[PDB]
Curated annotation (Swiss-Prot):
GO MF assignments: arachidonate epoxygenase activity; heme binding; iron ion binding; oxidoreductase activity, acting on paired donors, with incorporation or reduction of molecular oxygen, reduced flavin or flavoprotein as one donor, and incorporation of one atom of oxygen
Subcellular location: Endoplasmic reticulum membrane; Microsome membrane
InterPro entries the UniProt entry points to: Cyt_P450, Cyt_P450_CS, Cyt_P450_E_grp-I, Cyt_P450_E_grp-I_CYP2B-like, Cyt_P450_sf, Cytochrome_P450_fam2
Membrane topology: Peripheral membrane protein
PANTHER family: CYTOCHROME P450 2B6, CYTOCHROME P450 508A4-RELATED
UniProt-recorded name of the protein: Cytochrome P450 2B4
Enzyme class, first EC level, given as a word: oxidoreductase
Catalysis performed (reactions): an organic molecule + reduced [NADPH--hemoprotein reductase] + O2 = an alcohol + oxidized [NADPH--hemoprotein reductase] + H2O + H(+)
Gene Ontology biological process: epoxygenase P450 pathway; xenobiotic metabolic process
């Protein structure tokens, strides 16, 4: 068969030279109009299939769920192919270890009420920090990365850190050092400091010192966990990992398992922090721009929850307006616009084309979240996109911010619970304000017109009743 159509490739560098300063997404818009909703682009010598709009993406990821279930391969864009290989973590074992972690993640005890509990507790701690600010203008970027990372910490180590715990501050600094703590100005900051960062003396020394401290912490925590381990009551991720190790007959002193544990915990930290944090940050920017929406949410909190008690996950079912607002925030927020790449597990036939085994495939989630076939005003913030005439929450096929099919976001439940409880506990306790009138606030994704980054903004949290 033939691959889906697309712009003609240059031998060996494919379509890398033919991209626009306009931006990747707008360019994907152009190719789709020119070639349709399934097209092929060449990253160097390697073809990549691009899936646009709700229907094509669901046809692949749901209708042919297994065929499209392959995990992405980022080796693809890796320049060093004058050797090929990949230096893929010390042999067959590390393949073993990564699936050990995946299993542990997939086999790690939901304890939904215990996760809910952890998030309520974090939400309380956040409210006390916000009250202290006494309505001062602030940048909420660091706080929102703090609360989301602290949930991961509580699920991994069994308890949250204090916000100014030295080890917690090193974790947050590592986020900064790895770019998982960026703002609107960050890129001009990096640019200003480029000679420092890239020429001399770089940041590897500072990153090293952070990782050593984090590594020490984790090792000590592992020991303290092992010393009190109870198979009938796994407390957290470390316990579940230890339990699987015990079962595997694994050396308690393995360096491989120790390394593997830390890399898995870093993965969890990174996955669990940035997208959720940025969603909250964007949500409050939208709440500033639409004060009547925010008022309606506060009205619903009052009706269903009241003051007097903290929001609980069970309240969401009774708060369709608030739930719609959060859906809409995620929709317009569009945190992972190109999706996470998949590969097909075998030769795949798709709308009459053939996609060779192990070809990279991007389900462009932005093109579903903005699909006019499913949302009447894709580029306008409107909670009504998720509400019917009776005011009840409406299911929308186009709503796939966590992807779909076999490998939907493993954190989708924790993420949605954080969004619901953080948004409602904050708004129950505070009103918000900024120095910019709503009609003047600009929500366009800053950073070169593309890519990401919500505009950085100032906000006041004004304590209620
Ligand atoms: C608003 C927040 C979040 C968004 C929009 C987001 C979205 C995504 C998306 C689009 C994927 C790719 C699924 C695919 O391969 O098709 C995914 C992967 C995943 N997410 Fe999230 N996510 C968020 C929150 C979280 C959180 C809180 C965690 C918690 C640790 C997390 C963990 C992961 C995991 C482990 C994967 C890999 C799943 C698989 O390959 O097996 N995510 N997520």
């Amino acid at each position: 068969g033939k691959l889906p159509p697309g712009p003609s490739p240059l031998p060996v560098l494919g379509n890398l030279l033919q991209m626009d300063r306009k931006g990747l997404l707008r360019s994907f818009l152009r190719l789709r109009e020119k070639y349709g909703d399934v097209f092929t682009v060449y990253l160097g010598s390697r073809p990549v299939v691009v899936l646009c709009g709700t229907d094509a993406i669901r046809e692949a990821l749901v209708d042919q769920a297994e065929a499209f279930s392959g995990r992405g391969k980022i080796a693809v864009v890796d320049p060093i192919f004058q050797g090929y290989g990949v230096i893929f973590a010390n042999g067959e074992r590390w393949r073993a270890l990564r699936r050990f972690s995946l299993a542990t993640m997939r086999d790690f005890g939901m304890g939904k009420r215990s996760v809910e509990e952890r998030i309520q507790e974090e939400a309380r701690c956040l409210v006390e920090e916000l009250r202290k600010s006494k309505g001062a203008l602030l940048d909420n970027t660091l706080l929102f990365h703090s609360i989301t990372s602290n949930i991961i910490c509580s699920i991994v180590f069994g308890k949250r850190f204090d916000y100014k715990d030295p080890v917690f501050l090193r974790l947050l600094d590592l986020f900064f050092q790895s770019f998982s703590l960026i703002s609107s100005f960050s890129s001009q900051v990096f640019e200003l400091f480029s000679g420092f960062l890239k020429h001399f003396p770089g940041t590897h020394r500072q990153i090293y010192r952070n990782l050593q401290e984090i590594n020490t912490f984790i090792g000590q925590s592992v020991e303290k966990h092992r010393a009190t381990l109870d198979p009938s009551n796994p407390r957290d991720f470390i316990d579940v990992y230890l339990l699987r190790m015990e079962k595997d007959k694994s050396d308690p002193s393995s360096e491989f398992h120790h390394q593997n544990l830390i890399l898995t915990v870093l993965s969890l930290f990174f996955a669990g922090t940035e997208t959720t944090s940025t969603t909250l940050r964007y949500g409050f920017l939208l709440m500033l721009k639409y004060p009547h929406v925010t008022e309606r949410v506060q009205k619903e909190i009052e009706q269903v929850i009241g003051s007097h008690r903290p929001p609980a996950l069970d309240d969401r079912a009774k708060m369709p307006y608030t739930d719609a607002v959060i859906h809409e925030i995620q929709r317009l927020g569009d945190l992972i616009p190109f999706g996470v790449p998949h590969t097909v597990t075998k030769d795949t036939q798709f709308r009459g084309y053939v996609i060779p085994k192990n070809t990279e495939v991007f389900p462009v989630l932005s093109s579903a979240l903005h699909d006019p076939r499913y949302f009447e005003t894709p580029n306008t913030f409107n909670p009504g996109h998720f509400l019917d005439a009776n005011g009840a929450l409406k299911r929308n096929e186009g709503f796939m911010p966590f992807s779909l099919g076999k490998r939907i976001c493993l954190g989708e439940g924790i993420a949605r619970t954080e969004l619901f409880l953080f948004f409602t506990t904050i708004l129950q306790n505070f009103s918000i304000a900024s120095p910019v009138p709503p009609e003047d606030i600009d929500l366009t994704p800053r950073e070169s017109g593309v890519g990401n980054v919500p505009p950085s903004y100032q906000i006041r949290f004004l304590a209620r009743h």
